[PDB]
């Protein structure tokens, strides 16, 4: 069926949505710098329930108007604040292979980036899944920095909702 936002309307191919958390405790998805990263290249889930995160442009290569489950997808952050040094980086979501935390979701320029598509499946909650050329996108917490990183994990998938911008 069609993926629906929290107002009961079908997701529009190319529209901008906030990816909110099922849990009333967490906020939306956004970017942050982790490790040796100077630019916010790591896709993370906000710890602040009042934080909606960055608007995400959701599109499918298919010539359809409304996004449906199983449709191959591309996720791209809308514009957000970055230091001058990071101006111009790609904001498309990518899954990067070789990494301690497992394949991780990152933005910016990546060589070790896997080829594939994201897909949505009903769980109005859904879970993100990645299919290389499919793993549930879940959360991996770094207890030192408290950061909640988006990684593909056979563990409990991250359950989300969409709010049209």
Coordinates of C-alpha atoms in Angstrom, one line a residue:
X1 CA 0.0 0.0 0.0
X2 CA 1.0 3.7 0.1
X3 CA 3.2 4.9 2.9
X4 CA 1.2 7.5 4.9
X5 CA 2.3 10.5 6.9
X6 CA 0.9 11.2 10.5
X7 CA -2.1 13.0 9.0
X8 CA -3.2 10.0 7.0
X9 CA -2.1 11.3 3.6
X10 CA 0.1 9.3 1.2
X11 CA 3.8 10.2 1.0
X12 CA 4.5 12.3 -2.1
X13 CA 7.4 11.4 -4.4
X14 CA 9.8 14.2 -3.9
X15 CA 8.1 15.7 -0.9
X16 CA 9.9 16.8 2.3
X17 CA 9.1 15.1 5.6
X18 CA 10.3 15.0 9.2
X19 CA 11.2 11.4 10.1
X20 CA 9.8 11.3 13.6
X21 CA 10.3 8.5 16.2
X22 CA 7.6 6.1 17.3
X23 CA 8.8 6.6 20.9
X24 CA 7.6 9.8 22.5
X25 CA 11.0 10.0 24.1
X26 CA 13.2 10.6 21.0
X27 CA 13.2 13.3 18.3
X28 CA 13.7 13.2 14.6
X29 CA 16.6 12.2 12.3
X30 CA 19.4 14.7 11.7
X31 CA 23.1 14.9 11.0
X32 CA 26.0 15.2 13.5
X33 CA 29.8 14.9 13.5
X34 CA 31.1 11.7 15.1
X35 CA 34.6 10.3 15.5
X36 CA 37.2 12.3 13.6
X37 CA 34.4 13.9 11.4
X38 CA 34.7 17.6 11.0
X39 CA 31.4 17.9 9.1
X40 CA 28.1 16.4 10.3
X41 CA 28.4 13.3 8.2
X42 CA 26.7 10.8 10.6
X43 CA 23.0 10.3 10.4
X44 CA 21.6 10.2 14.0
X45 CA 18.4 10.1 15.9
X46 CA 17.9 13.2 18.1
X47 CA 17.7 12.6 21.9
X48 CA 15.4 15.7 22.2
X49 CA 11.7 14.8 21.9
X50 CA 10.9 18.3 20.8
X51 CA 13.4 18.2 18.0
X52 CA 11.8 17.2 14.7
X53 CA 15.2 16.9 13.0
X54 CA 16.1 17.9 9.4
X55 CA 13.5 17.8 6.7
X56 CA 14.2 14.8 4.5
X57 CA 13.4 14.7 0.8
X58 CA 12.0 11.3 -0.1
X59 CA 12.0 10.2 -3.7
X60 CA 11.7 7.1 -5.9
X61 CA 13.1 6.7 -9.4
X62 CA 9.7 5.3 -10.5
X63 CA 7.4 7.8 -12.3
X64 CA 4.8 7.7 -9.6
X65 CA 3.3 10.5 -7.5
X66 CA 2.8 8.6 -4.2
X67 CA 5.4 6.5 -2.4
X68 CA 4.4 2.9 -1.6
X69 CA 5.9 0.1 0.4
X70 CA 8.6 -1.8 -1.5
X71 CA 9.4 1.2 -3.8
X72 CA 13.1 1.8 -4.2
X73 CA 14.0 5.1 -2.4
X74 CA 16.6 7.8 -2.1
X75 CA 16.8 9.9 1.1
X76 CA 18.2 13.4 1.0
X77 CA 18.4 15.9 3.8
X78 CA 17.0 19.3 3.0
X79 CA 19.3 22.3 3.7
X80 CA 20.6 22.7 7.3
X81 CA 23.3 24.7 9.2
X82 CA 26.9 23.7 8.6
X83 CA 30.2 25.6 9.1
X84 CA 31.6 27.3 6.0
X85 CA 34.1 24.5 5.6
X86 CA 31.3 22.0 5.0
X87 CA 29.3 24.0 2.5
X88 CA 28.5 22.0 -0.6
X89 CA 28.6 18.5 0.7
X90 CA 26.1 15.9 -0.6
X91 CA 23.2 15.3 1.8
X92 CA 22.0 12.1 0.3
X93 CA 21.9 9.2 2.7
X94 CA 24.4 6.4 2.1
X95 CA 25.2 3.1 3.8
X96 CA 29.0 2.7 4.3
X97 CA 30.5 -0.8 4.6
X98 CA 33.8 -1.1 6.5
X99 CA 33.1 0.5 9.9
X100 CA 33.3 -0.7 13.6
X101 CA 29.6 -0.1 14.2
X102 CA 28.6 -2.1 11.2
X103 CA 27.3 -0.7 7.9
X104 CA 26.5 2.9 8.9
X105 CA 24.2 5.5 7.4
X106 CA 26.2 8.6 6.4
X107 CA 25.9 11.7 4.2
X108 CA 28.6 13.6 2.5
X109 CA 31.1 12.1 0.0
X110 CA 31.9 8.5 0.5
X111 CA 34.0 6.0 -1.6
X112 CA 33.3 2.9 0.5
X113 CA 29.6 3.6 -0.1
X114 CA 27.4 0.6 -0.9
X115 CA 25.1 0.5 -3.9
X116 CA 21.4 -0.1 -3.3
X117 CA 18.1 1.4 -2.3
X118 CA 16.2 2.1 0.8
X119 CA 12.6 0.8 1.0
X120 CA 9.8 1.3 3.5
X121 CA 7.6 -1.4 5.1
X122 CA 4.6 -1.1 7.4
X123 CA 5.4 -2.1 11.0
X124 CA 1.2 4.7 10.9
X125 CA 4.7 3.4 11.6
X126 CA 7.3 2.1 9.2
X127 CA 10.9 0.9 9.4
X128 CA 13.6 1.8 7.0
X129 CA 15.3 -1.1 5.2
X130 CA 18.4 -1.0 2.9
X131 CA 18.9 -3.3 -0.1
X132 CA 22.3 -3.6 -1.7
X133 CA 22.7 -4.7 -5.4
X134 CA 17.9 -6.1 2.7
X135 CA 18.8 -5.0 6.2
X136 CA 16.6 -3.2 8.7
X137 CA 17.9 0.2 9.6
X138 CA 18.3 0.3 13.4
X139 CA 20.1 2.3 16.1
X140 CA 23.5 1.8 17.6
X141 CA 24.2 3.9 20.7
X142 CA 27.6 5.2 21.7
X143 CA 27.3 5.4 25.4
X144 CA 30.2 7.8 25.7
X145 CA 28.8 10.5 23.4
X146 CA 25.3 9.3 24.0
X147 CA 24.9 9.5 20.2
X148 CA 22.2 7.3 18.5
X149 CA 23.7 6.4 15.1
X150 CA 21.7 4.9 12.3
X151 CA 23.2 1.6 11.2
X152 CA 21.8 -1.4 9.3
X153 CA 21.2 -4.0 12.0
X154 CA 19.4 -7.3 12.3
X155 CA 18.5 -6.0 15.8
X156 CA 15.3 -4.1 16.6
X157 CA 14.6 -1.9 13.6
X158 CA 14.1 1.8 14.1
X159 CA 10.3 2.5 13.9
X160 CA 9.4 5.9 12.3
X161 CA 6.5 8.2 11.3
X162 CA 6.4 11.0 8.7
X163 CA 5.2 14.5 9.1
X164 CA 4.8 16.6 6.0
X165 CA 6.8 19.9 6.1

